[PDB]
Design a binder for this molecule. Structure first.
Ligand SMILES: Nc1ncnc2c1ncn2[C@@H]1O[C@H](COP(=O)(O)OP(=O)(O)OP(=O)(O)O)[C@@H](O)[C@H]1O
Ligand SMILES: [Mg+2]
Ligand SMILES: [Mg+2]
Lengths: 352, 209, 369, 39, 498, 274, 240
């Protein structure tokens, strides 16, 4: 078993151990490695002889990637030699598994794959290579409703609705992230001495878990009027260009002028299903990309452009390059060019 | 061990012409190095023909003499070897001549117009900026001095064609040559030697005080 | 072995905390009110990571929170884990977490994870293999199998970008607290708390002192305190005053003031350069506020200097106008033009060869920016 | 990347010398490619 | 570990000369070692450790011994390389034992020489590295655990501050960082007096001249100079060191000893003579006519010495004139650099040689530093360029240290984008170089009798002095005909007796 | 383990009949139009001269200093050898093959041929020094004991200080005394630019030689001589004409040996001698 | 003799049928354990060659030689000792081996197999040491049908079972892959409670193996709900 870190590999191993009711042998990969060679082999052979003695058995080896590292260079220190000796010894233990007398099943868990040599993956040693990855939205509901059983809420229905909406707002997060935001909401309620997990508590837990804050400093600073004015004008320009050129899938939701960022502080309502997008959408994206520069050149002139408001037409030029080169809907041709080296010198003035 | 080619008449002709051209361009240049012996070694990996020339801070005129000398074997192969019989033996002298030209244009400042600008040094890993439209001027000067050297060598070697032919024939029939027989050849065959001062272009030559 | 004695640092002994102190007493609550945390169905977050510039007192913060928690304190160097041989480090971290487990309740501290927390696959050597083995062993001790709820680890790194994604995964290192450079009030509090141990006067306004040492770490404030202890024998005065700390801040900001033999035209040239710099600096809003203008030579800078402090908020956010830069280049073109206006074009000196390069670099950056 | 620590003296620079090095290298490589692939 | 516990080190501040700033700074530590209670009553915390950084031979160990002798305290001197062994952990135990021994005999001064061997930075450009790290960590722990009121002073001497760990440079470990600069002219004079007090000296030796004429010389180098002069006097069977012995030792250290009859032909020697005499004559003429702020030719030699076939000793000017290098001074120095090839062109016609290309290199770089790095002309440039060839400033070869150095850009170079400005800069540099070369050729061609007479005199005598060149210039005014020199009975004869 | 296998090479002295058999060797088909004429190879010819002079104890009578006749005869003989080094360095390992020449010349040599491996002096890492010193002194003492002997030292680029001192002392001492002066210390390598210049002295390991890759007529001649020595009569239609000149390659050593072995095995399978 | 080819093709099968047909002793070992430890690095090579020699005429077969004679066998001296011992054993040259080259005691062929022939050293594949090279490739259509019949004999295949119509789905498969396919067909037939293995069983097994490749591990209910999640206008475009 493998996949992204913190998905529940060892948790599934604990589930296997609990559900089996069979002789279970948990072990760690880093336990066997030291200076002195042959002691790793001695430890693992004692483990394998124990598993054979109480067969049938499930031997789970956590973090195979420690001993299982492929030779990625010369091993001057000699630890790699001990790692390889242990690896080949365990492979001989797997090959010594006769189908008539050894009902011993090897269960692994790791976070990386390219460091493993293609020797353990041979048939008869590791036949099934399963990956447990990020669950779908239904899996997200399942894992949060498992994780929200011991957490006190105001009522069951509000708990269900709030967990559902934070499930809709936890995309591309593993189960560890969901239990972390639930635990942090619990921490926030315990700090505020609130017996039930509140709405703002979940919102703030998710906010701190998506890493909005990066300075980590005491937020008390006198903002000048000439900063709030530029922020408000930029946000108004974005709002006007978004309302005049609407996007079918990303409508405006809120707008604030409280934080400093390279991009505007705008927020849109995401709607999945973007199967199709015509050339007019690309043209509108190019138009909307270069908004902050034009408003400041109009109201304030060219001598008042900020550094973060002048880096806006570069994104528009990049989107224009994407439209010209990698859509084929323009008059540049109907080919597809990756920018680095298959651009003949004839096409350079045309692109420009 | 065993020689890579048999000892015949056809194979020896390019090497005989090569060695004779080297000997003639050594002898005709005044105050230059002096040849001792010439021979055609059957089992020499450097080449069948072999020439031993011993030299007599170096000045500009010595470098011009060496640049003229670097074309002698190639010009001898051009006039003597028949068309269809080309030479790869004189390529190393051509590359050395090209190296000498770019050295004495850039490094020492001995350009065709005597400019003291220096773009390269003995410890340097690269040259100066030299722009983009100024490298063509440097290339033109290097081509100019290379062409002047080739023209000078051609002029001083086309006047002694019978001398070169006699040296080739005598080297082919004897396989061992001293300095005395070459002096005899350049004496009886009317060998017109050059005279000091030796300049590659007399349009800018001055004299010491 | 890895245990310390006589831990008495509290939140009072450390200065310039702010709302981070609130998070700090959260840890105290995590060590005191933990039964109410557990009854509300909440798992104790075992991983806190303090990130910031060096010299902010990360070890001091760990000692303070350990003393306020009232539990045993472990502080171990991460460089001891890295060894030229493989295997001893994993045993050391196993024994460390074991002795932390039996000494429950306790809090442990491990500093400078950048030696052992690097990515797996950035160096090809046996040292990298040992680092990977130790990282996996600490990974499996922190979350790997069930059986630890009472030991909490404390981490202090200067570069959080080198941290393994496996470690920052929820359940191992979830709480991330940034300790930044002290602002204004933190500098007052740090200077006062380092100055309690020295006899001091009642007329001592540290406001000007901290207004001189802008953007400096707490260790540098301790250094400023350290240049306010000895140097008074040369004059032999009674009590520490404002001007002594002002001069100490000036010394630690630029260097020692040394006097050497000089001619008059050299002084005229240097003063003309400083005059051009200050005169052009006056006429622009971007650097109008001028505090000092001197021509005395210092350590590393024979030339003079000028001091300007416009509000340091626009530079951090990046809101500087085009007119803000085009003026500054003009300011950096202040010396050379003065030479052209004083000694003629045929007698240009070579003192402005540094500011003129700054002007051309700024022009190129504004063009390509 | 604009040298977030402000200068207390005008002698100091406003942007770091190694900030814009990727753009210079890209322009140099593009110019060299244009020069080499034209003759 | 025999840390020598000497009750009297035998060195006081009277034996330290020219390090007066560091002596004044360390007098505070000497006073603290004398009466620590005076610092205690004031609430003054003494520094935990002091770093003496500087070039070797400046007597940092001698300064520490002087501090220990003046304070009258135990002195524990040990080298950092002695802490680096094969067995891991021995160095940390030695560190702990040394600190314990110092804490037993309070007050005391600990001295670690060559601390950069232990505190080498973990550069990102065996078990010895682990042992060094453990010893450095033990040293950091010991320094951090010091109470200021215990009266133990730690000193660490270093020659390369760049290799030092910045952890040691943090406050609380090395609070004072004192740079031991090379001694000045007065300091070198005092050091020479101290070292000449130990050896029989003749009254004709003027130590002030050798103090002024040897910049950058450390006290150890001056001691070696005195010892070598004594050895020369022993070799010459002199009862005392004469001024000739001093000059011979100076020439032995600077340009090396003379060989025995190792001479080339007359052709390859007259060219070097022409180059050196032309350079000296151009420098003297620029001094005479336009009153240039340039150096002076002391003496010229063509005898091989060390690895140099010829030499021109140049008297170094004061450093106050080495900062405000103006355009006329740089142009005159460019003329001096081009004067060698100018002499080859005016004397040997159009057949020059390689012996004048080296100077032709430096000028070809120097004008570039006029146009790009310094930006002295006023079409403004956008970027400078680094020197493709780098040559170290050195002895009798031309100064090229008028602005501290010639081949050292002050990080003022940028990569180019536009290539047309590069050829414009190249054209301007070629124009300036050609103009200066034409000017120095015109200047040298107007004085041919003096140049040829100096060449012949130097070729005969194999050495000449600057005053002899000046006398040749005085006796030969401009525009004299060459027949006046060619009609003399012996051109290589000088009637002046210095 | 190499000492027991080098001590047991010649456990007993060679039979007197073997001595008389080996002493009377002959030319064996040099002057044939098909294979290995006299001019083609001077290096192996000089090596055979060295071995043959080594066979008859003829280094021990190094020179005479006689009145007029013996000196002139020995002078002419000394000239006609080169157009008397007791130890030869060879450097020709640019292509392939070291055994194919030295065991080719060693079968007629009849003298005990001993190969000492320098790599055994590297794999032993104040006790290691004692082991190496005792081992090398026993090697040299044994090489003295079974004198006359021919010592081959392959891959001298590997050499560490103890063996260097051993060889310097051996070349300094065992060339002016130790009456068995006919001890060949020939040695081979493939990097001639690495050896220190202190081992190229005229007394110590001089007169280097070189071996180049085989040419097509040389390949034909080597093939014919390799096939003829085992009793196989090569067919008189492909070297008497241009038959097999257009097919044979493997233009290096170890290719003609393998091809000869393959062809001889194939012809053996059909019970043929041609 | 050097055996090369894709893994799982049965080179040891060729070695064992060689042993059975020859009727001679056959020394069989594996090359992964030859760089074991410091107790005996290169001594095992000498022992196994001597065991072959004492029962000659015999053969020696070592599996996955790439761990001994690889391109990194010279950087590490521990690999170098075993490689040098191996090179010494495969020749004659009586000194350092102590035996005559041409006798009954040398009739031993060194048989080696590997998966990446390009990772071997040039001096080991050099002629004289390795004479013959055999590349055993993956089977083909009819061979895959026969392998399926061999590995699916003792199972209750239904009347609709035919592997001739599923050959193109198994291009590049080895015998182990087809055996795993048969086993998974048995598992999936058990999964739905079906008594026999249907053609739809093998079709769904292959389809599950194909859908697992791109990272889609979904049951029927999640797949149906996700299909119902999308709209109808954006589905007709994909349909067209
Ligand atoms: N499907 C799930 N249902 C409930 N909890 C889950 C699930 N997946 C993960 N978790 C949470 O993840 C934690 C365990 O993570 P796990 O040990 O599987 O990560 P991991 O795969 O071991 O990562 P690493 O290999 O980096 O240690 C548990 O505390 C559990 O709360
Ligand atoms: Mg796990
Ligand atoms: Mg295999």
């Amino acid at each position: 078993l493998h996949g992204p870190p913190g998905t529940g590999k060892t948790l599934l191993a604990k589930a296997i151990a609990g559900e089996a009711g069979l002789p279970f042998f948990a072990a760690n990969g880093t336990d066997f490695v030291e200076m002195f060679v042959g002691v790793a082999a001695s430890r693992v052979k004692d483990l394998f002889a124990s598993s054979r003695s109480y067969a049938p058995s499930i031997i789970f080896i956590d973090e195979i990637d420690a001993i299982g590292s492929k030779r990625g260079g010369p091993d001057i220190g000699g630890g790699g030699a001990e790692r390889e000796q242990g690896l080949l010894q365990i492979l001989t233990e797997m090959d010594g598994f006769k189908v008539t007398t050894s009902q011993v099943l090897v269960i692994g868990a790791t976070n990386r794959l390219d460091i493993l040599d293609p020797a353990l993956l041979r048939k008869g040693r590791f036949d099934k290579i399963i990956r447990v990855g990020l669950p779908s939205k239904d899996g997200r509901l399942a894992i949060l409703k498992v994780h929200a059983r011991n957490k006190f809420f105001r009522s069951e229905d509000e708990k269900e609705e709030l967990l559902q909406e934070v499930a809709e707002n936890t995309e591309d997060f593993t189960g560890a992230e969901l239990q972390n935001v639930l635990n942090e909401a619990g921490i926030l309620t315990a700090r505020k001495d609130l017996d039930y997990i509140g709405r703002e508590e979940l919102l703030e837990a998710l906010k701190r878990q998506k890493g909005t804050f990066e300075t980590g400093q005491e937020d008390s600073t006198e903002v000048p009027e000439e900063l709030k004015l530029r922020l408000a004008y930029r946000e108004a320009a974005v709002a006007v260009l978004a309302c005049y050129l609407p996007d079918q899938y990303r409508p405006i939701s809120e707008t604030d002028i409280n934080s400093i960022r390279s991009q505007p502080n705008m927020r849109y309502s995401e709607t999945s299903g973007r199967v199709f997008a015509r050339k007019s959408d690309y043209v509108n994206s190019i138009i909307r990309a270069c908004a902050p520069r034009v408003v400041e050149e109009e109201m304030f002139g060219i001598e008042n452009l900020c550094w973060i408001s002048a880096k806006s037409t570069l994104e528009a030029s990049q989107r224009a390059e994407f439209l010209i080169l990698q859509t084929g809907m323009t008059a540049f041709g109907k080919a597809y060019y990756r920018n680095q080296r298959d651009l003949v010198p004839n096409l350079v003035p045309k692109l420009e | 061990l065993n020689p890579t080619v048999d000892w015949t008449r056809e194979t020896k002709f390019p090497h005989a012409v090569w060695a004779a051209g080297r000997a003639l361009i050594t002898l005709l240049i005044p105050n230059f190095d002096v040849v001792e012996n010439l021979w055609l070694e059957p089992s020499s990996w450097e080449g069948i023909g072999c020439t031993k020339i011993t030299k007599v801070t170096e000045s500009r005129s010595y470098l011009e003499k060496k640049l003229v000398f670097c074309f002698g074997s190639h010009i001898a192969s051009q006039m003597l070897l028949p068309p269809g019989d080309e030479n790869f033996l004189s390529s190393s002298e051509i590359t050395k001549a090209q190296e000498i030209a770019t050295r004495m244009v850039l490094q020492y400042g001995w350009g065709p117009d005597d400019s003291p600008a220096v773009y390269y040094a003995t410890n340097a890993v690269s040259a100066l900026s030299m722009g983009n439209n100024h490298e063509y001027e440097m290339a033109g000067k290097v081509e100019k001095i290379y062409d002047l050297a080739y023209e000078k060598a051609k002029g001083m070697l086309l006047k002694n064609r019978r001398v070169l032919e006699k040296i080739t024939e005598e080297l082919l029939e004897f396989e061992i040559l001293t300095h005395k027989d070459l002096e005899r050849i350049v004496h009886e065959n009317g060998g017109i030697r050059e005279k000091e001062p030796f300049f590659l272009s007399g349009t800018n030559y001055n004299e010491a005080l | 072995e890895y245990l310390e004695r006589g831990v008495d640092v509290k939140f009072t002994d450390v200065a310039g905390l702010g709302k981070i102190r609130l998070e700090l007493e959260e840890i105290v609550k995590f060590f005191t009110h933990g039964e109410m945390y557990r009854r509300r169905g909440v798992k104790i977050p075992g991983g806190i990571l303090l990130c910031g510039p060096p010299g902010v007192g990360k070890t001091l913060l760990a000692k303070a929170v350990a003393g306020e928690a009232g539990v045993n304190f472990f502080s171990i160097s991460a460089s001891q884990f890295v060894e030229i041989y493989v295997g001893v480090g994993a045993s050391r971290v196993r024994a460390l977490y074991q002795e932390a487990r039996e000494n429950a309740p306790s809090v442990v501290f491990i500093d400078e994870l950048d030696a052992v927390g690097r990515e797996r696959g950035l160096i090809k050597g046996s040292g990298g293999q040992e680092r990977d083995a130790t990282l996996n062993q600490l990974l499996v001790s922190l979350d790997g199998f069930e059986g630890r709820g009472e030991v909490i680890t404390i981490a202090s790194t200067n570069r959080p970008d080198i941290l393994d994604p496996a470690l920052v995964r929820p359940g191992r290192f979830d709480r991330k607290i940034f300790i930044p450079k002290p602002g204004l009030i933190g500098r007052m509090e740090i200077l006062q708390v380092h100055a309690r141990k020295k006899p001091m006067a009642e007329d001592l306004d540290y406001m000007a002192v901290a207004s001189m040492t802008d953007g400096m770490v707490g260790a540098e404030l301790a250094n400023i305190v350290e240049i306010a202890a000895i140097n008074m024998m040369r004059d032999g005065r009674t009590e520490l005053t404002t001007d002594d700390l002002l001069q100490a801040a000036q010394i630690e900001e630029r260097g020692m003031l040394d006097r050497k033999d000089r001619s008059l035209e050299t002084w005229r040239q240097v003063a003309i350069n400083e005059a051009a710099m200050a005169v052009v600096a006056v006429n622009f809003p971007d650097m109008k506020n001028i505090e000092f203008l001197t021509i005395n030579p210092r350590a590393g800078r024979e030339l003079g200097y000028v001091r300007v402090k416009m509000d340091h908020i626009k530079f951090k956010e990046g809101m500087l106008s085009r007119q803000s830069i085009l003026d500054h280049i003009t300011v950096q073109l202040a010396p050379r033009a003065a030479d052209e206006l004083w000694y003629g074009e045929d007698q240009l000196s070579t003192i402005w060869a540094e500011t003129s390069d700054n002007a051309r670099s700024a022009a190129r950056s504004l063009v390509l920016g | 990347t604009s040298q977030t620590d402000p200068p207390t003296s005008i002698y100091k620079r406003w942007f770091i010398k190694n900030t814009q090095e990727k753009h210079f290298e890209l322009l140099i490589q593009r110019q060299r490619w244009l020069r080499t692939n034209s003759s | 570990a025999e840390a020598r516990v000497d009750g009297s080190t035998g060195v006081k501040f009277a034996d330290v000369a020219g390090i007066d700033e560091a002596v004044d700074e360390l007098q505070e530590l000497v006073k603290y070692l004398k009466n620590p209670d005076l610092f205690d009553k004031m609430g003054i915390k003494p520094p935990h450790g002091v770093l003496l950084e500087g070039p070797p031979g400046c007597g940092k160990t001698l300064v520490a011994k002087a501090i220990a002798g003046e304070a009258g305290v135990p002195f524990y001197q040990m080298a950092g390389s002695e802490f680096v062994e094969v067995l891991v952990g021995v160095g940390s135990a030695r560190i702990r034992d040394l600190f314990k021994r110092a804490k037993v005999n309070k007050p005391s001064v600990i001295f670690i020489d060559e601390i950069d061997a232990l505190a080498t930075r973990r550069q990102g450009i065996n078990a010895a590295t682990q042992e060094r790290e453990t010893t450095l960590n033990q040293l950091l722990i010991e320094l951090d655990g010091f109470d200021t009121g215990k009266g133990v002073i730690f000193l660490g001497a270093t020659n390369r501050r760049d290799l030092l760990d910045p952890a040691l440079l943090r406050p609380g470990r090395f609070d004072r960082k004192i740079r031991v600069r090379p001694p000045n002219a007065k300091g070198r004079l005092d050091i020479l007096k101290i070292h000449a007090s130990k050896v029989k000296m003749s009254d004709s030796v003027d130590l002030s001249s050798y103090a002024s004429n040897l910049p950058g010389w450390s006290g150890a180098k001056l001691a070696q100079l005195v010892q070598e002069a004594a050895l020369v006097a022993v070799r010459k069977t002199h009862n005392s060191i004469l001024q000739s012995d001093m000059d011979d030792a100076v020439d032995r250290l600077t340009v090396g000893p003379t060989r025995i009859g190792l001479e080339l032909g007359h052709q390859g020697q007259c060219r070097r003579a022409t180059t050196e005499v032309g350079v000296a004559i151009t420098s003297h003429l620029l001094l005479r006519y336009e009153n240039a702020k340039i150096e002076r030719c002391d003496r010229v030699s063509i005898i091989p010495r060390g690895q140099t076939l010829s030499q021109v000793v140049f008297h170094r000017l004061d450093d106050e004139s080495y900062m405000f290098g103006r355009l006329p001074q740089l142009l005159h120095r460019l003329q001096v650099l081009l004067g060698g090839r100018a002499a080859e062109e005016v004397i040997y016609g159009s057949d020059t040689s390689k012996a004048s290309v080296d100077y032709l290199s430096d000028a070809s770089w120097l004008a570039r530093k006029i146009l790009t790095i310094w930006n002295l002309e006023n079409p403004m440039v956008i970027h400078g360029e680094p020197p493709p060839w780098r040559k170290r400033p050195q002895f009798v070869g031309p100064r090229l240290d008028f602005e501290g150095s010639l081949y050292d850009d002050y990080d003022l170079v940028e990569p180019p984008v536009n290539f047309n400005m590069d050829d414009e800069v190249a054209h301007r540099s070629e124009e300036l170089i050609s103009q200066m070369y034409n000017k120095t050729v015109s200047l040298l061609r107007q004085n041919q009798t003096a140049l040829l007479k100096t060449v012949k005199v130097l070729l005969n005598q194999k050495e000449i002095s600057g005053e002899a060149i000046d006398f040749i210039l005085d006796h030969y005014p401009p525009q004299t005909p060459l027949n006046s020199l060619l009609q003399e009975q012996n051109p290589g004869s000088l009637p002046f007796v210095p | 383990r190499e000492f027991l296998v080098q001590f047991s090479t010649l456990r007993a002295e060679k039979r007197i009949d073997q001595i008389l058999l080996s002493l009377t060797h002959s030319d064996h088909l040099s002057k044939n139009d098909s294979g290995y004429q006299m001019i083609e190879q001077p290096g192996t010819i000089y090596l055979r001269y060295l071995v043959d002079i080594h066979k008859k104890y003829l280094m021990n009578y190094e020179f005479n200093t006689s009145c007029l006749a013996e000196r002139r005869i020995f002078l002419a003989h000394y000239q006609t050898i080169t157009y008397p080094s007791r130890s030869i360095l060879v450097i020709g390992s640019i292509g392939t093959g070291r055994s194919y020449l030295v065991k080719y010349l060693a079968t007629n040599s009849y003298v005990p041929f001993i190969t000492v491996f320098l790599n055994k002096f590297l794999d032993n890492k104040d006790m290691m020094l004692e082991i190496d010193r005792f081992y090398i002194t026993l090697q040299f003492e044994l090489a003295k004991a079974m004198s006359p002997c021919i010592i081959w030292i392959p891959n001298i680029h590997d050499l560490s200080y103890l063996a260097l001192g051993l060889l310097v002392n051996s070349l300094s001492r065992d060339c002016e005394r130790c009456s068995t002066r006919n001890i060949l210390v020939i040695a081979s390598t493939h990097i001639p630019q690495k050896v220190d210049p202190a081992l190229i002295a005229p007394n110590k390991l001089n007169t280097c030689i070189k071996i180049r890759r085989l040419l097509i007529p040389q390949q034909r001649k080597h093939f014919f001589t390799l096939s003829y020595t085992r009793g196989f009569h090569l067919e008189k239609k492909m070297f008497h004409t241009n038959g097999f000149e257009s097919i044979t390659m493997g233009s290096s050593a170890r290719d003609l040996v393998a091809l000869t072995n393959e062809a001889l095995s194939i012809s053996i399978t059909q019970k043929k001698s041609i | 003799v050097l055996l090369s080819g894709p893994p799982g093709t049965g080179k040891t099968l060729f070695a064992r049928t060689l042993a059975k047909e020859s009727g001679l002793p056959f020394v069989f070992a594996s090359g992964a354990e030859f760089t074991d430890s410091e107790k005996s690095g290169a001594a095992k090579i000498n022992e196994m060659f001597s065991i072959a020699r004492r029962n000659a005429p015999a053969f020696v077969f070592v599996d996955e030689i790439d761990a001994i004679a690889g391109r990194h066998a010279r950087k590490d001296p521990r690999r170098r000792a075993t490689f040098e011992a191996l090179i010494a054993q495969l020749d004659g040259e009586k000194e350092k081996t102590g035996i005559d080259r041409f006798s009954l005691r040398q009739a031993v062929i060194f048989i080696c197999a590997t998966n990446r022939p390009d990772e071997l050293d040039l001096e080991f594949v050099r002629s004289g040491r390795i004479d013959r090279r055999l590349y055993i490739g993956l089977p083909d259509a009819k061979q895959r049908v026969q392998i399926f019949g061999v590995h699916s004999a003792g199972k209750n295949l239904a009347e609709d079972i035919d592997f001739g119509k599923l050959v193109f789905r198994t291009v590049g498969f080895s015998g182990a892959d087809i055996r795993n396919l048969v086993n998974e067909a048995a598992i999936m037939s058990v999964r739905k409670g079906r008594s026999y293995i249907y053609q739809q069983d093998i079709v769904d097994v292959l389809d599950k193996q194909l859908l697992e490749g791109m990272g889609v591990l979904l049951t029927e209910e999640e797949q149906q709900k996700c299909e119902q999640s999308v709209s109808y206008e954006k589905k007709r475009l994909l349909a067209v």
